[model samples]
Target: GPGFDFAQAIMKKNTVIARTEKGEFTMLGVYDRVAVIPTHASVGETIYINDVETKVLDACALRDLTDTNLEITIVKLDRNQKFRDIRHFLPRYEDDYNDAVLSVHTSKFPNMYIPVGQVTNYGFLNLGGTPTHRILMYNFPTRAGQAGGVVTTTGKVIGIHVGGNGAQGFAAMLLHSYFSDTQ
Candidate 1:
């Protein structure tokens, strides 16, 4: 079992501003369900980030989740520009088989059921139950900016919007998480 900080990740929102080579700008969207990509199986059902999607497998297709079970795909978006900022904009979720898990029974132990751990947690939150934060940016001529960004339940700033093709961007929690050695 794993623990996640879903509540905190959903609450924090800060705007980020960046300057483009030509001085153009845009804004970062809010973190919400819409920001999550859905799979084909969930044609109408809405699932948030780190949520679970299950599927049964046939005997022959017992090695891959995508092989017989449902799949999950995260919405990939740009998250940096110059000026402007938006609020509460949700991205679409796509439930494609691209990210799926597979399960099977141990051949040595006929009654023992086990999952293909590697594929089972595809597109799922990490071992800590925290969904991976993705940075989204608006497509504008200049660049992109953001404000009121959200932090993970563990108080980690996961997302940020900045400018420049190869320049460094601001990442508070991400930096701390990377440097911190505590588990």
Candidate 2:
């Protein structure tokens, strides 16, 4: 196997497509290469890498390659910011419903439906603090007739339809909590 050394030459500028509600945004491409010096490296220290490049034989190969022309609709809800997780103070006997969970009040909001996704995690704030649990949902679908029907705004995933029996969907803030905390 041959390894191309990117640390030798100066980096060149490039661009890539970024999708957003306002429309497609152009993101400037950055060329970076890092060579580490073992002795001086320390934790939490910022390191800079430069001098990396790649040549493509065909630009068209990088074009949009999805076979399905499906358009995903993402809706932003005003009340989403006010959304709250379901909490329980007492320990429950039922094994399935004992963990932290969120339920959709369909009677209160009929138009809103539960979004489809699997519960990722459910537990109290502290690892062993209390009976209260926090549930996280992910991998939601955008198909029609599904819980929380497809919602579209400027054509990006802004929120999910979560209004069903079990955890149905997630709001932007909830999603951000998972990602930001993970990092």
Candidate 3:
């Protein structure tokens, strides 16, 4: 609840889970960084979290996943509970670039999805990738995968998943200097 920082954001140990109205579950962030979440959801869905069974709590739509910036409105759960983490040592620009080091998700068991990045950047923005590298047009595994709820190898997060194009893709909760200044 207190002593939260980009340092703490980069250090949270577990995934914060958000159960959707569709009965689907997505990993938000640590318990601490809830302010930036409230992901891809319906307008009036009951968000059952880690503890409470029947969440009498309510959530109203603040915004939709329309673009790069994520600003959605939904009522919160027990605020007094402690945290989740982000605003990491991962990205260089450090303004939610979300340049995730790796991709992670759960399959039949836990699985390493792939590295989250952009095909457009491969030609220049990425050094290891070559001109021939691009988002696969017809690969089966490539088509089968997505960029949601993925985490870095270090077990840290940079952003929330915001659907990606053909190749590498998304990461968040907004961890700003302003937000961290408070308790």
Candidate 4:
């Protein structure tokens, strides 16, 4: 081999390893505490982080988690009490992300963090039990990453990865509102 360095790569990632009751996985920085797996993976089971049974918190379809979550939720229902419920949050009109301008993708392997690029086009990606709005990324991988948090190049996690192959689903800025909405 030429001058391929390993130590430097590991230092850059600084990720942690965790998994479910039957499988092992990775964790980026944020969303590390709550690993998001496929809806069927362990819906009723527990995930182990650092050999400790991790807390599988709220698990629901995050629809139109764009802008203020409250407004989006309110708009979803509209003024009408209720109808047939057809506010499908499939595909977004804007690709406004990249607050960090960088994202770290991870594979089944540990320490080694792969990179994901943005696509000009977008579409709906089905994860868990619902189809969500998502923009395609360049070079998506199967089992790409779950616990990794899909961290941006800023060394901070801005989005959460949906559990699926080359997950076309990713959400950000929404969790902040939910977390702080705790009154």
> After TM-score superposition, what is the CA distance of residue 21 in candidate 3 from its true location, in Å?
1.4
After superposition, the stretches of candidate 3 with alpha carbons farther than 4 Å from their true spots are 1-12, 30-38, 43-45, 50-75, 79-81, 84-99, 102-113, 117-156, 171-183
By TM-score: ranked, best first: 3, 4, 1, 2
Native RMSD of candidate 3 (Å): 9.5
How good is model 4 by TM-score?
0.47
User: Can you write out model 2's per-residue Cα lDDT over 38-107, one digit (the tens) per residue?
Assistant: 1111111221122112222111101113332111111112111121211111122211111122111122
Decoy 3 TM-score against native? 0.47
| lDDT, candidates in the order shown | 0.22, 0.21, 0.35, 0.35
TM-score of each: 0.18, 0.16, 0.47, 0.47
Best by TM-score: 3
- In model 2, the worst 10-residue window by lDDT is 1-10
**Alpha-carbon RMSD of each model:** 21.9, 22.4, 9.5, 12.3
Q: Please give, for residues 76-183, the per-residue lDDT of candidate 3 as tens digits.
A: 454456544344422332332222333333342233444433212111112123112111111113322233343343333444443443554433332333233343
Which wins on TM-score, candidate 1 or candidate 2? 1
What residue runs in model 4 are displaced by over 4 Å at the alpha carbon?
1-16, 28-45, 54-108, 119-123, 134-136, 142-149, 163-175, 181-183
lDDT of 3 at 61: 34
Candidate 4, run of 10 with poorest lDDT? 69-78
